[PDB]
Short mmCIF file of C-alpha atoms (C1' of nucleotides) in Angstrom, two decimals:
data_model
loop_
_atom_site.label_atom_id
_atom_site.label_comp_id
_atom_site.label_asym_id
_atom_site.label_seq_id
_atom_site.Cartn_x
_atom_site.Cartn_y
_atom_site.Cartn_z
CA UNK A 55 45.60 -83.68 13.60
CA UNK A 56 44.94 -81.57 10.55
CA UNK A 57 46.14 -79.00 8.06
CA UNK A 58 44.90 -76.23 5.82
CA UNK A 59 45.42 -76.75 2.10
CA UNK A 60 46.73 -73.87 -0.01
CA UNK A 61 44.20 -73.17 -2.73
CA UNK A 62 46.76 -72.34 -5.41
CA UNK A 63 49.31 -75.12 -4.90
CA UNK A 64 46.91 -77.73 -3.54
CA UNK A 65 49.32 -78.60 -0.76
CA UNK A 66 49.59 -78.21 3.00
CA UNK A 67 49.75 -74.49 3.69
CA UNK A 68 52.74 -73.51 5.82
CA UNK A 69 51.68 -72.43 9.29
CA UNK A 70 48.20 -73.96 9.10
CA UNK A 71 48.62 -77.25 10.97
CA UNK A 72 46.24 -77.80 13.88
CA UNK A 73 45.61 -80.40 16.60
CA UNK A 74 42.42 -81.06 18.54
CA UNK A 75 41.67 -83.42 21.42
CA UNK A 76 38.21 -84.96 21.32
CA UNK A 77 36.02 -86.96 23.68
CA UNK A 78 35.32 -90.11 21.64
CA UNK A 79 31.99 -90.97 20.06
CA UNK A 80 29.61 -93.05 22.15
CA UNK A 81 30.70 -91.33 25.35
CA UNK A 82 27.85 -90.71 27.79
CA UNK A 83 27.00 -87.99 30.27
CA UNK A 84 23.87 -87.21 32.28
CA UNK A 85 21.21 -84.80 31.15
CA UNK A 86 21.24 -82.85 34.38
CA UNK A 87 18.29 -80.44 34.18
CA UNK A 88 15.94 -79.02 36.78
CA UNK A 89 13.02 -76.77 35.86
CA UNK A 90 11.08 -74.63 38.35
CA UNK A 91 7.58 -74.07 36.98
CA UNK A 92 5.57 -71.07 38.16
CA UNK A 93 2.40 -72.37 36.49
CA UNK A 94 0.58 -75.71 36.30
CA UNK A 95 2.14 -77.12 33.18
CA UNK A 96 5.37 -77.58 31.32
CA UNK A 97 6.46 -74.90 28.82
CA UNK A 98 6.09 -75.59 25.12
CA UNK A 99 9.57 -74.33 24.25
CA UNK A 100 10.98 -76.63 26.93
CA UNK A 101 9.04 -79.59 25.51
CA UNK A 102 10.37 -78.56 22.10
CA UNK A 103 13.89 -78.49 23.54
CA UNK A 104 13.57 -82.01 24.94
CA UNK A 105 12.22 -83.21 21.60
CA UNK A 106 15.21 -81.56 19.90
CA UNK A 107 17.57 -83.30 22.32
CA UNK A 108 15.94 -86.65 21.58
CA UNK A 109 16.13 -85.87 17.85
CA UNK A 110 19.85 -85.13 18.17
CA UNK A 111 19.26 -81.57 16.91
CA UNK A 112 21.43 -79.73 19.46
CA UNK A 113 25.20 -79.33 19.10
CA UNK A 114 27.65 -79.01 21.95
CA UNK A 115 31.22 -77.77 22.11
CA UNK A 116 33.74 -76.70 19.51
CA UNK A 117 34.14 -77.62 15.83
CA UNK A 118 30.39 -77.94 15.38
CA UNK A 119 30.55 -77.29 11.63
CA UNK A 120 33.74 -79.24 11.11
CA UNK A 121 33.04 -82.75 12.40
CA UNK A 122 32.02 -82.48 16.03
CA UNK A 123 29.41 -81.66 18.63
CA UNK A 124 26.45 -83.94 17.88
CA UNK A 125 24.64 -85.33 20.96
CA UNK A 126 21.46 -87.36 21.41
CA UNK A 127 19.27 -87.83 24.49
CA UNK A 128 18.03 -91.22 25.69
CA UNK A 129 16.30 -92.48 28.86
CA UNK A 130 14.56 -89.11 29.37
CA UNK A 131 12.68 -89.08 32.68
CA UNK A 132 10.54 -86.29 34.12
CA UNK A 133 9.92 -86.14 37.87
CA UNK A 134 7.37 -83.67 39.21
CA UNK A 135 7.39 -82.15 42.72
CA UNK A 136 4.37 -80.02 43.63
CA UNK A 137 6.32 -77.65 45.85
CA UNK A 138 3.12 -75.59 46.16
CA UNK A 139 1.65 -78.39 48.30
CA UNK A 140 2.56 -80.44 51.38
CA UNK A 141 2.40 -83.75 49.56
CA UNK A 142 4.83 -82.48 46.95
CA UNK A 143 7.27 -80.92 49.37
CA UNK A 144 7.43 -84.13 51.42
CA UNK A 145 7.69 -86.03 48.16
CA UNK A 146 10.66 -83.79 47.38
CA UNK A 147 12.18 -84.65 50.75
CA UNK A 148 11.43 -88.37 50.71
CA UNK A 149 9.76 -89.96 47.70
CA UNK A 150 11.71 -89.14 44.47
CA UNK A 151 8.71 -87.60 42.73
CA UNK A 152 5.68 -88.19 40.53
CA UNK A 153 6.68 -89.88 37.26
CA UNK A 154 5.57 -88.37 33.95
CA UNK A 155 5.36 -90.56 30.87
CA UNK A 156 7.23 -88.45 28.34
CA UNK A 157 5.64 -90.39 25.46
CA UNK A 158 2.29 -88.77 26.29
CA UNK A 159 3.44 -85.14 26.09
CA UNK A 160 5.82 -85.90 23.22
CA UNK A 161 2.84 -87.19 21.23
CA UNK A 162 0.52 -84.38 22.36
CA UNK A 163 2.48 -81.60 20.60
CA UNK A 164 4.13 -81.23 17.21
CA UNK A 165 7.90 -80.96 17.28
CA UNK A 166 9.06 -77.75 15.59
CA UNK A 167 12.70 -77.43 14.43
CA UNK A 168 14.23 -74.19 13.23
CA UNK A 169 14.77 -74.31 9.45
CA UNK A 170 17.44 -76.68 8.28
CA UNK A 171 18.25 -78.80 5.26
CA UNK A 172 19.70 -82.20 5.99
CA UNK A 173 21.87 -83.69 3.27
CA UNK A 174 22.58 -87.40 3.62
CA UNK A 175 24.99 -88.68 0.97
CA UNK A 176 25.08 -92.41 0.41
CA UNK A 177 28.50 -93.07 -1.03
CA UNK A 178 31.02 -95.80 -1.53
CA UNK A 179 34.74 -95.60 -2.24
CA UNK A 180 35.20 -95.84 -5.96
CA UNK A 181 38.91 -96.02 -5.14
CA UNK A 182 40.15 -96.54 -1.57
CA UNK A 183 39.17 -93.62 0.63
CA UNK A 184 41.11 -92.96 3.79
CA UNK A 185 42.44 -90.16 5.83
CA UNK A 186 46.08 -90.77 6.69
CA UNK A 187 46.95 -91.74 10.25
CA UNK A 188 49.67 -89.40 11.45
CA UNK A 189 51.98 -92.21 12.58
CA UNK A 190 53.62 -94.74 10.34
CA UNK A 191 53.07 -98.35 11.23
CA UNK A 192 55.84 -100.89 11.31
CA UNK A 193 54.77 -103.10 8.43
CA UNK A 194 52.66 -100.37 6.78
CA UNK A 195 53.82 -96.79 6.42
CA UNK A 196 50.52 -95.11 5.54
CA UNK A 197 47.63 -96.35 7.73
CA UNK A 198 43.95 -95.39 7.79
CA UNK A 199 42.83 -93.08 10.56
CA UNK A 200 40.66 -94.90 13.10
CA UNK A 201 38.61 -93.47 15.93
CA UNK A 202 36.98 -94.95 19.03
CA UNK A 203 33.24 -95.41 18.55
CA UNK A 204 31.71 -96.78 21.69
CA UNK A 205 33.86 -99.69 22.79
CA UNK A 206 35.03 -100.33 19.19
CA UNK A 207 37.30 -98.54 16.75
CA UNK A 208 36.06 -97.61 13.27
CA UNK A 209 37.79 -96.07 10.28
CA UNK A 210 36.90 -92.40 10.07
CA UNK A 211 36.83 -89.57 7.58
CA UNK A 212 36.66 -86.47 9.79
CA UNK A 213 34.03 -83.95 8.85
CA UNK A 214 36.94 -81.52 8.78
CA UNK A 215 38.20 -83.34 5.70
CA UNK A 216 34.85 -83.45 3.91
CA UNK A 217 34.15 -79.84 4.87
CA UNK A 218 37.46 -78.64 3.45
CA UNK A 219 37.11 -80.43 0.12
CA UNK A 220 33.58 -79.05 -0.26
CA UNK A 221 34.78 -75.57 0.67
CA UNK A 222 37.57 -75.87 -1.88
CA UNK A 223 35.12 -76.75 -4.65
CA UNK A 224 32.77 -73.93 -3.67
CA UNK A 225 35.63 -71.43 -3.75
CA UNK A 226 36.88 -72.82 -7.05
CA UNK A 227 33.47 -72.40 -8.70
CA UNK A 228 33.14 -68.78 -7.53
CA UNK A 229 36.68 -67.85 -8.52
CA UNK A 230 36.08 -69.38 -11.96
CA UNK A 231 32.84 -67.46 -12.48
CA UNK A 232 34.74 -64.34 -11.44
CA UNK A 233 38.00 -65.48 -13.12
CA UNK A 234 39.67 -64.48 -9.87
CA UNK A 235 43.16 -65.74 -9.08
CA UNK A 236 44.27 -66.82 -5.64
CA UNK A 237 47.92 -67.37 -6.56
CA UNK A 238 49.11 -64.09 -5.04
CA UNK A 239 46.93 -64.24 -1.93
CA UNK A 240 47.96 -65.94 1.28
CA UNK A 241 45.96 -68.82 2.74
CA UNK A 242 43.68 -66.61 4.82
CA UNK A 243 43.10 -64.34 1.82
CA UNK A 244 42.50 -67.35 -0.41
CA UNK A 245 39.56 -68.40 1.74
CA UNK A 246 37.74 -65.07 1.87
CA UNK A 247 35.29 -65.30 -1.01
CA UNK A 248 31.59 -64.57 -1.41
CA UNK A 249 28.95 -67.23 -0.57
CA UNK A 250 31.63 -69.52 0.83
CA UNK A 251 32.19 -67.26 3.84
CA UNK A 252 28.59 -68.01 4.89
CA UNK A 253 28.17 -71.64 3.93
CA UNK A 254 31.54 -72.56 5.39
CA UNK A 255 32.42 -69.70 7.73
CA UNK A 256 35.17 -67.15 8.12
CA UNK A 257 37.78 -67.02 10.83
CA UNK A 258 37.13 -64.72 13.74
CA UNK A 259 39.84 -62.12 13.15
CA UNK A 260 39.56 -58.60 14.55
CA UNK A 261 35.19 -58.98 12.80
CA UNK A 262 34.52 -61.02 9.66
CA UNK A 263 34.28 -64.28 11.62
CA UNK A 264 31.25 -66.45 10.95
CA UNK A 265 30.31 -69.97 11.75
CA UNK A 266 29.45 -72.13 8.77
CA UNK A 267 25.80 -72.59 7.99
CA UNK A 268 26.92 -75.95 6.58
CA UNK A 269 28.06 -78.62 9.05
CA UNK A 270 29.57 -82.01 8.18
CA UNK A 271 29.70 -85.03 10.46
CA UNK A 272 32.60 -87.32 11.02
CA UNK A 273 31.83 -90.24 8.76
CA UNK A 274 32.67 -93.63 10.24
CA UNK A 275 33.00 -96.96 8.48
CA UNK A 276 30.29 -99.56 8.77
CA UNK A 277 33.16 -101.92 9.63
CA UNK A 278 34.33 -101.88 13.25
CA UNK A 279 37.09 -103.60 15.22
CA UNK A 280 37.98 -104.23 18.82
CA UNK A 281 40.72 -101.84 19.99
CA UNK A 282 43.27 -104.62 20.49
CA UNK A 283 42.50 -106.00 17.02
CA UNK A 284 43.55 -102.69 15.48
CA UNK A 285 46.60 -102.41 17.74
CA UNK A 286 47.55 -105.83 16.39
CA UNK A 287 47.56 -104.25 12.92
CA UNK A 288 49.43 -101.15 14.09
CA UNK A 289 52.04 -103.27 15.87
CA UNK A 290 52.43 -105.70 12.98
CA UNK A 291 56.11 -105.77 12.02
CA UNK A 292 56.03 -107.89 8.84
CA UNK A 293 53.71 -107.37 5.89
CA UNK A 294 53.60 -111.09 5.09
CA UNK A 295 54.27 -112.00 8.68
CA UNK A 296 52.16 -111.04 11.66
CA UNK A 297 50.26 -108.42 9.61
CA UNK A 298 48.30 -111.14 7.83
CA UNK A 299 46.81 -112.56 11.06
CA UNK A 300 46.15 -109.03 12.31
CA UNK A 301 44.38 -107.99 9.10
CA UNK A 302 42.41 -111.23 8.94
CA UNK A 303 41.18 -110.58 12.49
CA UNK A 304 40.36 -106.89 12.03
CA UNK A 305 38.40 -107.32 8.78
CA UNK A 306 36.45 -110.19 10.33
CA UNK A 307 37.77 -112.90 7.99
CA UNK A 308 40.21 -114.82 10.21
CA UNK A 309 40.40 -117.85 7.88
CA UNK A 310 40.20 -116.10 4.47
CA UNK A 311 43.15 -113.91 3.51
CA UNK A 312 41.38 -113.23 0.19
CA UNK A 313 38.26 -111.81 1.85
CA UNK A 314 40.36 -109.94 4.39
CA UNK A 315 42.35 -108.22 1.64
CA UNK A 316 39.17 -107.41 -0.28
CA UNK A 317 38.44 -105.11 2.67
CA UNK A 318 41.87 -103.85 3.75
CA UNK A 319 44.57 -104.28 1.12
CA UNK A 320 48.27 -103.64 1.73
CA UNK A 321 49.82 -101.89 -1.26
CA UNK A 322 53.47 -101.29 -2.12
CA UNK A 323 54.59 -98.25 -4.09
CA UNK A 324 58.04 -97.81 -5.64
CA UNK A 325 59.56 -94.80 -7.40
CA UNK A 326 61.53 -95.77 -10.50
CA UNK A 327 64.74 -93.97 -11.46
CA UNK A 328 64.36 -92.36 -14.87
CA UNK A 329 67.95 -92.89 -16.01
CA UNK A 330 68.52 -96.42 -14.77
CA UNK A 331 65.10 -98.00 -14.42
CA UNK A 332 65.96 -99.15 -10.95
CA UNK A 333 63.70 -98.91 -7.96
CA UNK A 334 64.81 -95.70 -6.29
CA UNK A 335 65.23 -97.57 -3.02
CA UNK A 336 64.42 -95.48 -0.03
CA UNK A 337 61.47 -94.31 -2.13
CA UNK A 338 59.65 -97.55 -1.36
CA UNK A 339 56.53 -97.00 0.76
CA UNK A 340 53.45 -99.02 1.70
CA UNK A 341 49.78 -98.10 2.14
CA UNK A 342 47.01 -100.09 3.81
CA UNK A 343 44.30 -99.25 1.31
CA UNK A 344 40.72 -99.61 2.64
CA UNK A 345 39.53 -100.89 -0.75
CA UNK A 346 36.45 -102.64 0.62
CA UNK A 347 35.61 -100.64 3.71
CA UNK A 348 31.93 -99.68 3.63
CA UNK A 349 31.08 -96.25 5.02
CA UNK A 350 28.05 -94.75 6.68
CA UNK A 351 26.30 -91.98 4.72
CA UNK A 352 27.90 -88.55 4.89
CA UNK A 353 25.68 -86.32 7.02
CA UNK A 354 25.69 -82.67 5.99
CA UNK A 355 23.52 -80.17 7.87
CA UNK A 356 22.69 -76.81 6.32
CA UNK A 357 21.49 -74.44 9.04
CA UNK A 358 18.97 -72.48 6.96
CA UNK A 359 18.21 -70.36 10.04
CA UNK A 360 21.89 -69.38 10.25
CA UNK A 361 21.86 -68.29 6.59
CA UNK A 362 18.72 -66.22 7.17
CA UNK A 363 20.43 -64.32 10.00
CA UNK A 364 23.37 -63.63 7.70
CA UNK A 365 21.13 -62.49 4.88
CA UNK A 366 18.78 -60.62 7.25
CA UNK A 367 15.73 -62.87 7.02
CA UNK A 368 15.11 -62.35 3.30
CA UNK A 369 14.98 -65.83 1.75
CA UNK A 370 15.53 -64.52 -1.77
CA UNK A 371 19.22 -64.14 -0.88
CA UNK A 372 19.24 -67.80 0.11
CA UNK A 373 18.94 -68.86 -3.52
CA UNK A 374 22.52 -67.98 -4.60
CA UNK A 375 23.87 -69.88 -1.58
CA UNK A 376 21.55 -72.84 -2.22
CA UNK A 377 22.59 -72.68 -5.89
CA UNK A 378 26.28 -72.93 -4.99
CA UNK A 379 25.55 -75.77 -2.58
CA UNK A 380 23.73 -77.68 -5.34
CA UNK A 381 26.54 -76.95 -7.82
CA UNK A 382 28.98 -78.39 -5.28
CA UNK A 383 26.81 -81.47 -4.74
CA UNK A 384 26.62 -81.89 -8.50
CA UNK A 385 30.44 -82.00 -8.53
CA UNK A 386 30.54 -84.35 -5.55
CA UNK A 387 28.18 -86.70 -7.36
CA UNK A 388 30.19 -86.47 -10.61
CA UNK A 389 33.41 -87.65 -8.87
CA UNK A 390 35.00 -84.22 -9.16
CA UNK A 391 35.68 -83.94 -5.41
CA UNK A 392 38.06 -86.65 -4.18
CA UNK A 393 38.34 -87.12 -0.44
CA UNK A 394 41.27 -87.77 1.87
CA UNK A 395 44.83 -88.84 1.27
CA UNK A 396 46.53 -89.64 -1.99
CA UNK A 397 43.90 -88.35 -4.40
CA UNK A 398 46.32 -87.99 -7.33
CA UNK A 399 47.97 -91.23 -6.20
CA UNK A 400 45.21 -93.77 -6.69
CA UNK A 401 42.88 -93.04 -3.79
CA UNK A 402 39.94 -90.86 -2.89
CA UNK A 403 37.38 -91.05 -5.71
CA UNK A 404 33.89 -91.81 -4.44
CA UNK A 405 30.64 -93.01 -5.93
CA UNK A 406 27.53 -91.17 -4.81
CA UNK A 407 24.50 -93.43 -4.97
CA UNK A 408 21.96 -91.08 -3.46
CA UNK A 409 21.61 -87.61 -2.02
CA UNK A 410 18.69 -87.28 0.38
CA UNK A 411 17.67 -83.68 0.94
CA UNK A 412 15.60 -83.48 4.13
CA UNK A 413 14.36 -79.98 4.91
CA UNK A 414 12.60 -79.21 8.17
CA UNK A 415 10.52 -76.01 8.29
CA UNK A 416 11.86 -74.89 4.91
CA UNK A 417 10.24 -71.87 3.25
CA UNK A 418 7.79 -72.75 0.48
CA UNK A 419 10.17 -71.60 -2.29
CA UNK A 420 12.87 -74.00 -1.09
CA UNK A 421 10.32 -76.76 -0.35
CA UNK A 422 11.22 -78.41 -3.70
CA UNK A 423 14.52 -79.21 -1.98
CA UNK A 424 12.75 -81.92 0.05
CA UNK A 425 13.86 -84.62 -2.34
CA UNK A 426 15.89 -87.79 -2.70
CA UNK A 427 18.21 -87.46 -5.69
CA UNK A 428 19.81 -90.25 -7.70
CA UNK A 429 20.70 -88.41 -10.88
CA UNK A 430 24.13 -86.86 -10.20
CA UNK A 431 23.10 -83.79 -12.21
CA UNK A 432 20.21 -82.96 -9.85
CA UNK A 433 17.45 -83.51 -12.40
CA UNK A 434 15.33 -84.98 -9.60
CA UNK A 435 14.95 -81.37 -8.49
CA UNK A 436 12.02 -79.66 -10.19
CA UNK A 437 13.17 -77.95 -13.36
CA UNK A 438 11.07 -74.89 -12.54
CA UNK A 439 12.82 -74.78 -9.18
CA UNK A 440 16.25 -75.39 -10.74
CA UNK A 441 15.50 -72.70 -13.30
CA UNK A 442 14.31 -70.50 -10.45
CA UNK A 443 17.60 -71.06 -8.62
CA UNK A 444 19.52 -70.73 -11.89
CA UNK A 445 18.05 -67.27 -12.42
CA UNK A 446 18.91 -65.96 -8.96
CA UNK A 447 22.35 -67.54 -9.38
CA UNK A 448 22.94 -65.84 -12.73
CA UNK A 449 21.83 -62.51 -11.29
CA UNK A 450 24.35 -62.75 -8.46
CA UNK A 451 27.03 -63.76 -10.96
CA UNK A 452 26.38 -60.54 -12.88
CA UNK A 453 27.07 -58.55 -9.69
CA UNK A 454 29.07 -60.91 -7.46
CA UNK A 455 28.26 -58.77 -4.46
CA UNK A 456 28.49 -59.84 -0.84
CA UNK A 457 25.08 -61.07 0.19
CA UNK A 458 25.17 -60.15 3.89
CA UNK A 459 25.27 -56.45 2.98
"C1'" A B 296 24.67 -47.77 83.35
"C1'" C B 297 24.64 -53.37 79.51
"C1'" U B 298 26.97 -56.93 72.33
"C1'" G B 299 21.20 -54.40 67.96
"C1'" A B 300 18.23 -57.35 65.07
"C1'" A B 301 17.72 -59.34 60.30
"C1'" A B 302 20.13 -59.62 54.86
"C1'" C B 303 22.94 -66.08 49.78
"C1'" U B 304 28.03 -61.47 46.25
"C1'" G B 305 24.48 -63.01 43.65
"C1'" U B 306 21.93 -62.39 38.65
"C1'" A B 307 22.66 -63.10 32.56
"C1'" G B 308 26.73 -64.90 29.22
"C1'" U B 309 28.19 -72.31 24.79
"C1'" A B 310 36.10 -71.43 25.16
"C1'" G B 311 34.51 -70.53 20.42
"C1'" A B 312 35.07 -69.14 14.73
"C1'" A B 313 38.18 -70.55 10.71
"C1'" C B 314 41.79 -74.45 8.53
"C1'" C B 315 41.14 -81.17 3.46
"C1'" A B 316 46.86 -84.23 7.32
"C1'" A B 317 48.13 -83.20 2.89
"C1'" U B 318 51.88 -82.92 -1.59
"C1'" C B 319 55.60 -86.15 -5.13
"C1'" G B 320 56.79 -91.59 -6.10
"C1'" G B 321 54.81 -97.92 -12.07
"C1'" G B 322 56.51 -103.11 -6.67
"C1'" G B 323 60.33 -102.30 -10.21
"C1'" U B 324 64.67 -104.62 -12.83
"C1'" C B 325 70.90 -107.68 -16.25
"C1'" G B 326 76.05 -107.80 -16.43
"C1'" U B 327 79.85 -110.22 -14.22
"C1'" C B 328 82.60 -111.06 -9.83
"C1'" A B 329 87.64 -111.60 -7.60
"C1'" A B 330 93.67 -110.10 -7.61
"C1'" U B 331 97.44 -111.92 -8.12
"C1'" A B 332 102.22 -114.28 -10.00
#
RNA sequence: ACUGAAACUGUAGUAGAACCAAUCGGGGUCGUCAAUA
């Protein structure tokens, strides 16, 4: 379940709620391929495809840029049937085929990806980070969103949520540089801005629709629980009753309520009447704050090949988009982009320990992007490269034209 | 005053793009209570 956020008011935009059903993570299906060869080999591009599948490079289904679609291949087997020959036709009828060791061919050619920049952000909650679960619990009103991950459940920040906060910061930077106001515009108008329509995409309305060059994974917690352990928390009726067993079990500290609550902490909030100083009862609510939930690194994928198609192959246009992306990562590392629920209400600030920039087949001028950063201000990037980007950025600022012509 | 035969409705096409489940709220605090005879 999700919602668009109005860029002026900062609140759920009216008419922009959405729901999506998803096959859970860790679900399996067969790779079900047959290839008819008309020559005595196996095609390079098909070997490259199988390498990409084993690398996890291919996305499937909807919401590819906004949380979903990542698949990886395992147990790859190749069976050969020489249908040109009697032994191979009867093998096809009877014998289940000549086995190929994939490890031989996979070693015997270099894997080539299309251009992309991986961004892996190692982060920790500086203050509790959760997405809200849509249903109130019984003991706890506001519960973390969990998702099934294999046979377990994990806490999740959907890549929809991280995408939207990053898009919001991108759009805010551009509108500042232009001193452009989105107060009058409607939500769809508020989103249409230059350089963000390519990094994040534009809705397909009849067409300015574009898929985002930038894709964000669902980020799951390093903590996991059995499904019935989390149901025990969801069903818990009493915060100091059966919730304490349930939270002790789920956090993995069944005999230490202290260590359990250093991971998942129940928190009461009360609104105080200004005239009387009384708890404005009925305005009491409770949050299960994931104060000590550890999270896997945020995986962001910039499809550099997608940007090139938008900019018509000329990589000089890439530099203003790359510049914006680095300016957004500078804000993400400086705690300026809180994530999830309750960001003005004591949650959502993150530490960024490390940004790993992992470009495959990058052009030589963006090759300085292949870096692991630990300064939040990106000074691990070569100053000549950052000045190079800074110049192309400043030129675009002077004429904030639509690169995409 | 003699049944035609034989012929794969297939071939190419990702149900997808876009959308932050979010906004506000100190876990807080002081005057009685009761109605008869």
